[PDB]
Every structure is written in structure tokens, then in C-alpha cells.
């Protein structure tokens, strides 16, 4: 019955503050042993500790950031917050708030976690992606399977929803995690089908980017010269 939920602004402007709200249920921030901890996890890297706010308010900070971090609560509403000041690009990561409790004379652990919030630092302005097809040529089709690609370049912010033949085609498909190219996201997806199907039967790339209220398709027409 215990649960925690991180709330956040998702995306923050460089050198501005952001404030995470951890809403929980199943315990109060009063019961003696209790306390909330805030963990951070940059994209692909490992877990980093941020701070832990205890019931007595003997909060302890990550030394490397105390100057920017600040922890607090509103025990009546069961929320616990974390404010970060002057955030830099490096602060982009997934933030977890976990329920930490000191059980006995020897045991203290972060028993339950949330799912985290995705806070990204970038002065990038929302922009839809321009899609480009990937049709093989110059070393063109024979009896086997051919790999078709689709490129999604220069968008913001994440994420993108990429599908093939509006869901129809889905067994040999590979969509790769994006990458930042000049504070702009780029990524591709590779779908693979037996020649017997393409070009004979149309193949389209379904690209959607919530943030810009855009949805676009790109037909993989075979190479010409």
C-alpha cells in the first residue's frame, strides 16, 4: 500500500531552478524511523544520492551539491520536495524519491521507490523532426532480406514515437536511442523485410513527436541511380 510519485517540470531552462514533488501514501513523514531520499540517475549512468529528509528534519545533503540542493516537506499533505538552484545541462537525469526508513539498531534502507521524473536541462526551443527515408542502392537487392531505414533528425524535446507501416510491420525493427546534436535530438530506426515484400509492397515510416503536435510518414521508395 506504500507508494511514491515524483512530480516535476520535465524540462528546465539552463541556470533556472526546478522543484520536484514527491507525493506518497502509506506512511507519514512523522513516524519516527521514516524519511524520504532523493536519488538521481543521468541518462545511461548509475545511481547518485542527493539528499534525505528525515522526520526530525536532520536532513543530510550530497556534499557535491548542497550549495544548490534544498530539501523539505509538508507532512500534512504527505508530500516531500526537493529544490535545485541554478541547474546546468549536467543536471539532466531521472529523479527518484524513495521511502527510506531506519528499522532497527542496524538496518536503514530505501525500501520503496518511485519511478522517477525526467528532468532535462536545455535551452532548446520545441521543434518537430524532419524525417528522411533510407533506401539502399549502389549495392542493391537480391533474393534475401533487405534492411530499410528511417531517419528522425533535429527535434526537441524527447520523445518520439516511431513505427513501421502504422504498426503492421514489427518483427525486424530497430529504433535506436537518440543523441544530442547541437542541443537537438537525432535518431534512426531500421526495419528489415525479405525482398519478396519490398519494393513490391509499400513500406512506410510512422514518425510522431507529441510536443509539436506533429505526425509524419515517409515512404521508403527504392534508390534511383
Amino acid at each position: 500500500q506504500i507508494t511514491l510519485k515524483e512530480s516535476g517540470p520535465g524540462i528546465v531552462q539552463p541556470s533556472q531552478p526546478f522543484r520536484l514533488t514527491c507525493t506518497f501514501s502509506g506512511f507519514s513523514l512523522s513516524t519516527s524511523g521514516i524519511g524520504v531520499t532523493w536519488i538521481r540517475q543521468p541518462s545511461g549512468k548509475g545511481l547518485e544520492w542527493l539528499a534525505t529528509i528525515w522526520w526530525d528534519d536532520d536532513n543530510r545533503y550530497n556534499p557535491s551539491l548542497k550549495s544548490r540542493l534544498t530539501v523539505s516537506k509538508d507532512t500534512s499533505n504527505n508530500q516531500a520536495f526537493l529544490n535545485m538552484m541554478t541547474v546546468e545541462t549536467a543536471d539532466t537525469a531521472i529523479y527518484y524519491c524513495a521511502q527510506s526508513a531506519i528499522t532497527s539498531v542496524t538496518d536503514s534502507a530505501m525500501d520503496h521507490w518511485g519511478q522517477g521524473t525526467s528532468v532535462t536541462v536545455s535551452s532548446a526551443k520545441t521543434t518537430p523532426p524532419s524525417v528522411y527515408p533510407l533506401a539502399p542502392g549502389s549495392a542493391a537487392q537480391t533474393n534475401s532480406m533487405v534492411t530499410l531505414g528511417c531517419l528522425v533528425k533535429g527535434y526537441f524535446p524527447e520523445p518520439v514515437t516511431v513505427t513501421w507501416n502504422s504498426g503492421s510491420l514489427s518483427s525486424g525493427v530497430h529504433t535506436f536511442p537518440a543523441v544530442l546534436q547541437s542541443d537537438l535530438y537525432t535518431l534512426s530506426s531500421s526495419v528489415t523485410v525479405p525482398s519478396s515484400t519490398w519494393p513490391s509492397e509499400t513500406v512506410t515510416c510512422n514518425v510522431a513527436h507529441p510536443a509539436s503536435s506533429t505526425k509524419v510518414d515517409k515512404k521508403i521508395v527504392p534508390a534511383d541511380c
Binding site: 528525515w54 526530525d56 536532520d58 543530510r60 531506519i102 532497527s104 539498531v105 542496524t106 538496518d107 536503514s108
Partner: peptide, 12 residues
């Protein structure tokens, strides 16, 4: 007092 480092003596 109750310390938050290891031997949670105050637990007794």
C-alpha cells in the same frame, strides 16, 4: 538525540 549514521543506538 537520534543519529542517522549506522549504530542506531537511539533505537534501544
Amino acid at each position: 538525540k537520534h543519529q542517522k549514521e549506522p549504530p542506531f543506538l537511539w533505537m534501544g
